[PDB]
Amino acid sequence: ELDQLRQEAEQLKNQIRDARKACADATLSQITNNIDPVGRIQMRTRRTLRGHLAKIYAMHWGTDSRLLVSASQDGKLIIWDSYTTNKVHAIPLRSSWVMTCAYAPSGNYVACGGLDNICSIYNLKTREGNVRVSRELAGHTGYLSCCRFLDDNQIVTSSGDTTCALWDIETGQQTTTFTGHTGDVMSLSLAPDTRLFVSGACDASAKLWDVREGMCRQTFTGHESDINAICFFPNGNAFATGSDDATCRLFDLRADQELMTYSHDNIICGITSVSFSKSGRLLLAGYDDFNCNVWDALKADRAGVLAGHDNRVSCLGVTDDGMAVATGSWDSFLKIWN
Amino acid sequence: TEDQRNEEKAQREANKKIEKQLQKDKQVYRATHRLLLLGADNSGKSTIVKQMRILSGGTSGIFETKFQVDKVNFHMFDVGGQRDERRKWIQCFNDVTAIIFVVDSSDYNRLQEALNLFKSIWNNRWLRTISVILFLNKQDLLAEKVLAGKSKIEDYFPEFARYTTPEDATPEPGEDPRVTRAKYFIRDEFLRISTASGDGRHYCYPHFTCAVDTENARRIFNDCKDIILQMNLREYNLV
């Protein structure tokens, strides 16, 4: 029966491959050759958020596109005011090895996780005003990789246990778990309708999940190595994945396959963080070679390089208005480009 | 703008407080040296952890081991709560001064696995600047094993019979040239991987430890002293 199971799995894989091949009309490059190229894009460093002692893994812009949270391996969750270049808060964590941080859409709460297998939620606008550990979310067996507030009560959290979990901050319990992966899931990105997110794992596959149903709808494969960065196209019907094979892909949920490769020959370093502009034309990708890159999502032609970091860049976020992008890197500096 | 001015002064005061506390934390972060402890289950890394704990407290998966010797305190990190795949969370330990590797010196079956693990550590793109403090643990078990027969390390490693003990040996009075040859053969195996990459930017410091080896914190103390010394010499123009 097991041999029959493998044979029928092969038949289903052949069926999905045939459907993908049939649905492939032409290349996105051919149909976007009627667009004029964007042109060279120069974004100077407006700020250099300089208050971190160790390397920085994650940053997350706020809803107001003014305040942001940055997590460094010293054990701090410094919340800055980008316009004023001021640190409105400096949250002392418990475990210094933090890998993620999330700023809630409302702004009342901030999350952080890491090697402790715990997603800690901090309330900011508390009665006194001193930041405290609001909740301690336990249940992940592997390390913690990416936290993202779905709202003030829930949070989607990826871990090193190949499982994602939709949490309930009010009670501290997993409402529904997303267990369909093979490798360690690193980055997750929520939809504009906050109903279908993706989980980018170390099995060269990103899977699309239902927040309410709790079961994967469509898997997305085609990468050559582990993906540790993922972000939806601003509508929610496409996303991009950055892996260690020095390429960024564009997967289309409607067509259920890859659209275009974003990779040059001279780049041989893995992408660490990806993010789109407010129109979805500037797919910024942070690479291990101490600098970022800017791509034209419709032509794959690289237009702009956000160099300026002395160590590996690890986090990358674009303001909800698209007026800035902050690239926190391992040199403990958050340079806000414009 | 007077209201805006006073509210922004209420922000610069918070910034000043945060700066003061961050300098105070800087006077604590650079005064401690984070250490990372790897190894396998059979390797008695927990015994060394307890021994240096006597010279602090943690039960949340990652067993921190705070210990000070000569008024300087290191911070060991016994991370073991994660899965068997470690190619992604090992990148957090890039700024660690030294990776502590405890190898089970009395296991011939699982010794090639330890060399493979060391080779992976010695060649990571994000670990290629971290010197390793090798710890060949419980040499007493190896001494008992070689001195009782059925210790054909020449079988599991075929290049033992065609091997001779190094001239730069340090034998204890009760030792046997045979157990000395074996225990330096493991060391030379690890240094063979050590002296094959990492062009003068990180070094493997090998040390022999038994089960009850009290002088373990001081050995790491001196090794870290040398590590910091070398990084300062390349940090200056001396090199």
Epitope: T182, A204, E224, S225, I268 | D84, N123
Partner: nanobody, 126 residues
């Protein structure tokens, strides 16, 4: 998708010769340090040998050093492991494993839990 399918393998007398082949697919083959991993019956996963991108960093496991000779044909996306003089110890399930990061000389693929880039494997009965 990343698909490493193992061919060869079968009944072996104590001292037979087999051409273990790994028809890999789904990526540019000549960019990864391919390596072999065994699965001894009732025992954990162990490393067999590895070969670099070009074939200049060949390294064998300690136990079987002269019995096994690995060789990759980069233009055929394959990993050969010429296994002659097979002892009963080599009655394991061999696995053709690819290191995750392109252009690197190390990888953590001895993981008992399913490593993402590792084939289904063949059983060689000696």
């Amino acid at each position: 998708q990343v698909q490493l399918q193992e061919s060869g393998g079968g009944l072996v007398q104590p001292g037979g010769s087999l051409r273990l082949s790994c028809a890999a697919s789904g990526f540019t083959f000549s960019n990864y340090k391919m390596n072999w991993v065994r699965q001894a019956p009732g025992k954990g996963l162990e490393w067999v040998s590895d070969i670099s991108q070009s074939g200049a960093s060949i390294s064998y496991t300690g136990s079987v050093k002269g019995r096994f000779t690995i060789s990759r044909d980069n233009a055929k996306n394959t990993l050969y492991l010429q296994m002659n003089s097979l002892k009963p110890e080599d009655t394991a399930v061999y696995y053709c494993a690819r290191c995750p990061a392109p252009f690197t000389r190390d990888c953590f693929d001895v993981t008992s839990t399913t490593y993402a880039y590792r084939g289904q494997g063949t059983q060689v009965t000696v």
